[PDB]
Amino acid sequence: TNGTMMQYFEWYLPNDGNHWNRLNSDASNLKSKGITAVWIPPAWKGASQNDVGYGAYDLYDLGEFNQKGTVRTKYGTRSQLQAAVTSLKNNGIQVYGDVVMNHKGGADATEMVRAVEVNPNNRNQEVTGEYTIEAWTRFDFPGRGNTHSSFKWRWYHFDGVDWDQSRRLNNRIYKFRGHGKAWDWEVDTENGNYDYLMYADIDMDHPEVVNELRNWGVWYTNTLGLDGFRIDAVKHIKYSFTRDWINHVRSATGKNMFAVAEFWKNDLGAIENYLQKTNWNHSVFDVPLHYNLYNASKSGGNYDMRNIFNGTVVQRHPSHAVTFVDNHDSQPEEALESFVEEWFKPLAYALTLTREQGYPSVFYGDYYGIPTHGVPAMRSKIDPILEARQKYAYGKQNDYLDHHNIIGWTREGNTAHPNSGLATIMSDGAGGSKWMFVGRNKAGQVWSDITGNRTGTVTINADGWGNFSVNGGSVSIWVNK
Template sequence: MKTPRLSLTTIIFTFFLITILSGCNNGDSDNYTVAPPEPLPGKADLSQYDNGKRVMMQAFYWDVEPRFEWWEILSRKIEDWAASGIDRIWLPVATKGQSGEFSMGYDPSDYFDFGEFDQHNTIPTRFGTRSDLEALIGKAHNNGLEVIADIVLNHNSGGGEEFNPYRNKNTHTLFNKDHGNASGMFNRNYEDFHPNSIHEHDEEALFFEEQDLCHHQSRVQEWLWKGENSVARYYKDIMKFDGWRFDYVKGYGSWVVKAWNDEVGGFSVGEYWDGSAPKLIEWVEASGSAAFDFACFYKLDEALDRNNDLTILEGDMLWKTHPDKAVTFVANHDTEKDENPENNISTANKMLAYAYILTHNGYPTIFYSDYENETYKSRLKDLIRIHNTMATGPIEVLYSSPEEYIMRRNGTKDNPGLILYMNISSGHKQRTIPSNWKDQSLVDYSNNTSAWLMTDSEGQVTIEAPARSFSIWSVSQ
């Protein structure tokens, strides 16, 4: 049986004649003419399908500019992000680093200097003053957004020099008011780093050897999460952060993240940079925290950039076994500056990758530089809207080949779900598939085609997708 299709552009230029798609799958079609329906099918009001899901915004990129103004710049974005369906913003490391005004925060020196102490040749951080940050957090909360703090627990930088008996040489492990810790809180010395009187190193690999924090030291635990004035409690109770992004969690035991979260709670995601789904699963189960789904990231990179083979998406990913613990992403501050093409997804394929994570399970993260890029912005807004409304219900892969991937979200009793069609070939593709909708018109909510389709009495329909692009089908209004 042939399935009707109508292109709105064709209507205008052919006096309301439409094309009937055949059941063939090679891009060919037979032409017929039928009277168009009245009224023409259009998109449904998606607000009626709110599924309660939202997305997170990574609100920075590497070496943001201009210096000292970032918190103010973000404050001006809050209303738009909230209206677009974002429910959390992940901020860069908010405290003073050794590099002072040039620091992105991953060289942490003073955990309690949010831009108010004169040290490392600056009072504000690269991002602004403490008052600017507090204003940003307040505005985010007033617009219903949670604010996620980036926490670096593995290593410290910018301390004063002292003799270290465990290394039999001088090391920069002295942190006090005169040496990189002007707040006077969480002063440290060589006993708080590795090696020390307890052991040589943490359970996991060393990253920043000479200033590698020892999480087994009781006073380190008190200052990081246990004590009344701990970093965790200060960030939550005083600064009003709502959750945590833990940097480089391979550098210490998973028990550290679990202990932190048991003490103060809040949303939590760890940067366990590994493309192995089993390793990610092991970490999230041990820590109790969510993790960035690097397995998904690398599968998308392999499928879209390296191998041009969408069957790779059938492989293991964290979201497939632990959807509530998987934070999916297409780009972040590290991948975007990485010159190794195997560690980033190409510009040409970014929207395909976003279409994948925003229609599948997991908690998607949008990268600031992508969302604020006018090339992507309107399309990302459409995908976020689709994610927050119709991307629900069990997932079924209906068809998979090197060039094509078709997935169905089966929806719920009150939600129609959707069908995603990814096509990485150089030509327009069509394929006949089963849907959950009988005798209903469908439209492409991605806006990548202007066609409408009609399912038959059994739910069969021939869907289409443009070359090197995608379409997302669901019932019309």
């Protein structure tokens, strides 16, 4: 109950190889602040040392082998990583490892492959005849050899690429020809078929590939003692593959591994379809909510706060929603930039952390800041909200999303959690107040604002109602502290 996840990384982190050590030493602090699970960045070797990890080169090289001109990953060595995981385990924190199975970048060499070009806006349409290209599809892992795995990758393990080394044409997507070669299905349908994204696209129609990824999933889980996964680019991955990959790993390890997938599309309909096709066996990030939060912080007070949860995953399917404010996709200077403004960020974290539905995530970028882009650390403003969730956000929830600026909700608390109960009130515009029911058993209690934004107190009347206040463009969370 009331667990809280933290994405322990941001895109522009320094390439000093000291991140695992940072996580190691931060473990006890994170636990005290209310963090119960840590999602670590890609732990394997990327196309280069400074690769964030999504340009996944070798999933079996966790900063252990000399490959790509380096032994360590951007974050550190395998031993530093494992020492970090131990520190988290010792402090009772669950560990979720990132998972990148849609593609492989940084191939060791090229191969001559027969293929056709397809329409980038409709991959279902071939725009050229057949011809030979030079594709980066060969992986031999020279620095690792067969350690951990003898599986080698070749062009037939992929469906296509976006670069012909012999001609170097731009804005092209190549679909390989051959027995049983075709874009996978089912996948998101934007662009006709969104199977292809970047680098060499892994062919989930190939049995050797499916067998290899499942085996790696188990090895990965057992090697690091992972408790769950954060799955990358699932809208570009054959839906049934992801569903069954998760099932396989859970069954092979005997661990009911938690899993949250990133289906990045601001479309509830698309996300709900993904959930049905994967048989609801895992969660997804609430991307629609992220956009609602983002758009609200950009509307200068004119966003209708009554609709903040409209069209979101947490509203329609609370048990399968992982709620976040921002991540590495939406942070400054990214293709999908849509960063929730600072003034609104605290309201956003209050909206995800103090409500009873959804599994909230704290973004390292918001918590410790993003110095390369002028984003200050907001942990001083997040910690209070985290304490509210940890100690007060329990019991029955009463909603008051009844005003275009001032909205709020209360938690009545439960005996399982001593003194629990709260009244969150916020305004994306002018400040004000709102009467809310917190429970008749709270009659006479003198509540105060855990965020400290409001300095007075609010006494619950005989009938369990308190007249709570909030300042403009702010959030207050009253508790009986």
